[PDB]
Amino acid sequence: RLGTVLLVSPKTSFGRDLQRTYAGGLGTVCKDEDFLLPPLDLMRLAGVLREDADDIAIADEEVTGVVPSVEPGTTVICHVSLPSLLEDAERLATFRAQGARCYAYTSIRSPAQWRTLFERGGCEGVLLPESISFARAALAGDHTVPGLVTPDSLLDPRHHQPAFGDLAAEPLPARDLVDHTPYMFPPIARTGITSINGSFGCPYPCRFYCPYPLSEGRKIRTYPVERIVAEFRQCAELGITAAVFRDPVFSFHRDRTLELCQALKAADTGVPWWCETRIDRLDEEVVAALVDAGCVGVEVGVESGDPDMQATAVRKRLNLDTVRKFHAVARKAGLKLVFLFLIGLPRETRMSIRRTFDFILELGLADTEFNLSVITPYPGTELHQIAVDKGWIDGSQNAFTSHNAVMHTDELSIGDLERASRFVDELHAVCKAGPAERAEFQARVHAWSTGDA
Ligand SMILES: N[C@H]1[C@@H](O[C@H]2[C@H](O)[C@@H](O)[C@H](N)C[C@@H]2N)O[C@H](CO)[C@@H](O)[C@@H]1O
Ligand SMILES: C[C@H]1O[C@@H](n2cnc3c(N)ncnc32)[C@H](O)[C@@H]1O
Ligand code: SF4
């Protein structure tokens, strides 16, 4: 049945600097954001609903424009992020006041925030990642369905053990329902790029701070390679210029990765792609396979440039010399790189932060081959609860931008972390410039790390 359905990534005061897909689907906000990705989750929902829906459309109001109004009676699904949960609850109440049977889609696993969605937003339910596979039943009324949160049984312990349905029978995302031209991925193409998943979840212990296992579960759940190949053929046929994999650890299964590479090569879709993965799930053979299969580059997590931080707080048992050797193998194979760094994990000191910057300049990374995040305690992670029990969070959640200093540790004050927060803007500007700016930035960081005012 279903009737008219409109899936909307609502408008916010953040603009397109808000990228709802990142940080485990809770959203990042990065000033002058040039990684503008399409509303993948809404497209997957459209893909599963499209069979039993009279009409269905997708509206990224930051691109297509704000939906003027809705006709009363139709379903509206909004994408609620974390740093804009209030604005998206307001948009959800706006659709409710026009007789829309409102729903909400989010990766937020915090019954406290769901409360705000049923109260201000007035949602007949809240949809979570697990719900996508069953998104039909959810709107048919069934509530024993995973990923669907009523305001009734708002504290069922099923919503912290994400039961994932049969991923292999999921329809392809309705990528044909969205003009991909306004979507950008600078390291590959400036127009018409799309996002894609080949697997979900992550089992690693750095779930202490990272939200990806919280949003997606601690179990790797893969799609069949032949579905991903079908997606690449779909992208070529639609005229999409690039495909960006959102898998937290794309190369987790090594043999599966080589098989997927060979299959993508055989398909000869001529679609270039990008992926995210751990350094310790990459070796020379797998890198060669990726470059050969059409992968332009990878985002890998280094987090810190301080050896002791690697042996403790980073929780990856990642060695800095392994990072160096991987840098050599990746440049020597022509794979583009973006190293992912993190400032302000508990146990971090000034000299630790400075040694991170020291590592970034030692490696000689262009401005485009690194990204620095400021530690933000995402609700549902162990770090957020330890941060509450220690009065660590000084900022409000509408600044839970992955780049705003919003919490201090037992070793660092928000003045130190806000200072570093601005030092990352300095590092980008200074990496755009020449050696003379990088030596005077490296002087400042040394002086700031020593003194300890
Ligand atoms: N792909 C990872 C990476 O995402 C970043 C990306 O590296 C950066 O180049 C963009 N300008 C902003 C974008 N949020 O870093 C983010 C954290 O800052 C992670 O949440 C995300 O999964
Ligand atoms: C998924 C990527 O995002 C970064 N990352 C992981 N957890 C956090 C957090 N709590 N706050 C800010 N950035 C984080 C890491 O660098 C990782 O590589
Ligand atoms: S492996 Fe990557 S995505 Fe997974 S928890 Fe660790 S940092 Fe986060």
Where residue 11 sits, what CATH number does that domain have?
A: 3.40.50
Q: Is 30 annotated as a binding residue?
A: no
Q: Under 8 Å CB-to-CB from 148, ≥6 apart: which residues?
A: 125, 126, 127, 128, 131, 134, 138, 142
What is the SS3 assignment for 104? strand
Find the domain containing 143 and state its range: 4-167
Q: What angle do CA 148, 153, 155 make, to 5 degrees?
A: 90
CA–CA dist 231, 270 (Å, integer): 12
Answer yes or no: is 426 within a domain: yes
Pick the closest to residue 352 from 363, 341, 340 (CA basis).
341
Q: Are residues 201 and 222 in the same domain?
A: yes
Ligand 1 pocket mutation, candidates 17, 20, 22, criterion most atoms within 8 A of CB: 22
Q: After which residues is the chain broken (C to N over 2.5 A)?
A: none
Ligand lying nearest the CA atom of residue 25: 1
- Ligand 3, atom 3: closest residue by C-alpha: 248
Q: Is 206 annotated as a binding residue?
A: yes
Q: Under 8 Å CB-to-CB from 10, ≥6 apart: which residues?
A: 61, 78, 79, 87, 88, 91, 92
Cβ 407 vs Cβ 395: under 8 Å: yes
Ligand 2 pocket mutation, candidates 82, 206, 209, criterion most atoms within 8 A of CB: 209
Q: Which of 100, 132, 167 is the endpoint of a domain?
A: 167
Query: CA 202, 205, 209, 212: dihedral to nearest 10 degrees?
Result: 0
**Range list of H helices, 162-245:** 212-216, 225-238
Pick the closest to residue 155 from 115, 106, 121 (CA basis).
115
What is the SS3 assignment for 449? helix
Answer yes or no: is 174 within a domain: no
Cβ 77 vs Cβ 88: under 8 Å: no
| C-alpha separations of 241 from 197, 221, 345 in Å | 16, 27, 37
* Size of the chain in residues: 453
212 C-alpha to center of ligand 2: Å? 9
Q: Are residues 18 and 142 in the same domain?
A: yes
Atom of ligand 3 nearest to the CA of 213: 5
What is the SS3 assignment for 149? strand
| C-alpha separations of 378 from 101, 110, 118, 273, 432 in Å | 29, 10, 21, 29, 31
Pick the closest to residue 81 from 391, 407, 376 (CA basis).
376
The amino acid present at 444, given as its one-letter code, is R
328 C-alpha to center of ligand 3: Å? 23
Cβ 363 vs Cβ 327: under 8 Å: yes
Q: Copy the structure tokens of residue 172.
A: 């392809």
Ligand lying nearest the CA atom of residue 356: 2
Tell me which residue has tokens 């540790």: 409
Q: Which residues line ligand 1 (CB under 6 A)?
A: 19, 22-23, 28, 30, 33, 35, 276, 299, 338, 340, 371, 373, 402
Record the resolution, in angstroms: 2.5
Q: Under 8 Å CB-to-CB from 292, ≥6 apart: which residues?
A: 261, 265
What is the CB-side half-sphere exposure of residue 386 using CA atoms within 13 A? 11
Q: Are residues 183 and 279 in the same domain?
A: yes
Ligand lying nearest the CA atom of residue 203: 3
Residues paired with residue 8 on neighbouring β-strands, in sequence order: 59, 78
Q: Are residues 214 and 146 in the same domain?
A: no
Q: Are residues 110 and 235 in the same domain?
A: no
CA–CA dist 68, 423 (Å, integer): 42
Q: In the chain, how many domains are there?
A: 2
CA–CA dist 251, 15 (Å, integer): 32
Q: Are residues 101 and 201 in the same domain?
A: no
Q: What angle do CA 438, 401, 135 make, to 5 degrees?
A: 135
Atom of ligand 1 nearest to the CA of 28: 14
| C-alpha separations of 400 from 18, 23, 374, 379 in Å | 11, 11, 10, 10
Q: Are residues 131 and 253 in the same domain?
A: no
Backbone dihedral angles phi then psi of residue 451, each to the nearest 5 degrees = -20, -55
Q: Which residues line ligand 2 (CB under 6 A)?
A: 209-210, 212, 301, 303, 340, 342, 373, 375-376, 378, 402
Q: Are residues 192 and 297 in the same domain?
A: yes
Greatest CA separation found in the chain? 68
Q: Are residues 43 and 135 in the same domain?
A: yes
Q: How crowded is residue 10: how many other Cβ atoms within 10 Å of its Cβ? A: 25
CATH value at residue 311: 3.80.30.20
| C-alpha separations of 17 from 20, 35, 126, 211, 403 in Å | 9, 9, 25, 19, 11
Q: Are residues 157 and 209 in the same domain?
A: no
Q: Under 8 Å CB-to-CB from 324, ≥6 apart: which residues?
A: 363
The answer, yes or no, to whether any atom of ligand 3 lies below 6 A from the CB of 101, is no
Answer yes or no: is 172 within a domain: no
Residues paired with residue 60 on neighbouring β-strands, in sequence order: 9
Q: Which of 167, 187, 207 is the endpoint of a domain?
A: 167
CA–CA dist 176, 68 (Å, integer): 23
210 C-alpha to center of ligand 2: Å? 5
Q: Are residues 370 and 417 in the same domain?
A: yes
Cβ 53 vs Cβ 211: under 8 Å: no
Q: Which of 167, 190, 216 is the endpoint of a domain?
A: 167
Answer yes or no: is 107 within a domain: yes
